[PDB]
């Protein structure tokens, strides 16, 4: 039975490259939090950056950082517990989920992304495994290990590093030497929305050599996953998944969309 200062580490909630996440229970107060354990030896620069960004975050749709402790080579990051687990586990394969549930989660995801963008942070790996749920099914954006600053002192910096998850990544990230941060997070949110409504990802990657990607650019929406999605949400996906990032819809314009504003069950 291991432990750190006043807390005991009681079960493994997830694993991952750098380490694992444990459910941590304060023996005394009985509060329960999640602890991300990282083996600094197994990079120490990387956690310096992650903790720094983590301390900036204060929003109801973003995971909260409570503090940390270095104990020799291991860093313990104390963070909010999302006891409903992941959005990934609410998606039925080949089905999706009810449209009203998808719309609610989409609203919550936009609120968290507008918050991050407004403090000049980009997440860079939005996908259902990184979107967690509290006990009342409120969404929380999680995993800031690839996050970075894109605006500082009111001045934007373009990105150049390749990163993320291929099926969710925007096409400019594969084709351009440097690109703007915000339209890349908007694109990944569009892939999430397709997942929630269809239970299927549309392509392996958004390249000219991928047939499924070519089929979309040729507007063949009688094919899957598109043919499973109602016309109203499909019209929003046509404005998000636009190849040219400067023609792609922005978040203030998403908030004006017809489906975004439709009252549902």
Please give the annotated binding residues, written as ranges: 13-21, 36
What is the residue whose two structure tokens read 């197994």?
Answer: 42
Closest CA to 206 of 175, 180, 170, 237: 170
* Residue 94 φ/ψ, nearest 5 degrees: 70, 0
Distance CA 49, CA 83 (A): 26
Part of the chain binding ligand 4K4 (CB under 6 A), chosen from 77-85, 158-166, 222-230, 237-245: 77-85
Locate 189 and state its tokens: 């949110």
Candidates 59, 64, 74, 84: give the one binding ligand 4K4 (CB under 6 A).
84
- 125, 143, 253, 257: the catalytic one is 125
Kindly state whether residue 87 participates in binding ligand 4K4, applying the rule CB under 6 A. no
Asked whether 41 and 61 are in contact (CB, 8 A), the reply is no
Kindly state whether residue 99 participates in binding ligand 4K4, applying the rule CB under 6 A. no
Asked whether 35 and 9 are in contact (CB, 8 A), the reply is yes
Kindly state whether residue 124 participates in binding ligand 4K4, applying the rule CB under 6 A. no
Binding-site entries for ATP: 13-21, 36
Kindly state whether residue 53 participates in binding ligand 4K4, applying the rule CB under 6 A. no
Type and span of the H or E element at 258: none
Annotation marks residue 208 as catalytic: no
Kindly state whether residue 193 participates in binding ligand 4K4, applying the rule CB under 6 A. no
Indicate the residue among 13 and 232 with the shorter CB distance to ligand 4K4.
13
Q: Which residues are catalytic?
A: 125
């Amino acid at each position: 039975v291991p432990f750190v200062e006043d807390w005991d580490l009681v079960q493994t909630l997830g694993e991952g490259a750098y380490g694992e996440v444990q459910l941590a229970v304060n023996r005394v107060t009985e509060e329960a939090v999640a602890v991300k354990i990282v083996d600094m030896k197994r990079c120490p620069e990387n956690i310096k950056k992650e903790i720094c960004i983590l301390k900036m975050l204060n929003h109801e749709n973003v995971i909260k950082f409570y503090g940390h402790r270095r104990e020799g080579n291991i860093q313990y990051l104390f963070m909010e517990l999302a006891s409903g687990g992941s959005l990934f586990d609410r998606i039925e394969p080949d089905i999706g989920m009810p449209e009203p549930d998808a719309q609610r989660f989409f609203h919550q995801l936009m609120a968290g992304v507008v918050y991050l963008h407004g403090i000049g942070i980009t997440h860079r790996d939005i996908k259902p495994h990184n979107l967690l749920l509290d006990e009342r099914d409120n969404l929380k954006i999680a995993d800031f290990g690839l996050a970075t600053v894109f605006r500082y002192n009111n001045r934007e910096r373009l990105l150049n590093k390749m990163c993320g998850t291929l099926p969710y990544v925007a096409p400019e990230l594969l084709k351009r030497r440097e690109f703007h941060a915000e339209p890349v997070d908007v694109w990944s949110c569009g892939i999430v929305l397709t997942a929630m409504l269809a239970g299927e990802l549309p392509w392996d990657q958004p390249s000219d050599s991928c047939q499924e990607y070519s089929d979309w650019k040729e507007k063949k929406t009688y094919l899957n996953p598109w043919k499973k999605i109602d016309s109203a949400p499909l019209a929003l996906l046509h404005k998000i998944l636009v190849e040219n990032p400067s023609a792609r819809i922005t978040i203030p314009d998403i908030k004006k969309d017809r489906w975004y504003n439709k009252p549902l069950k």
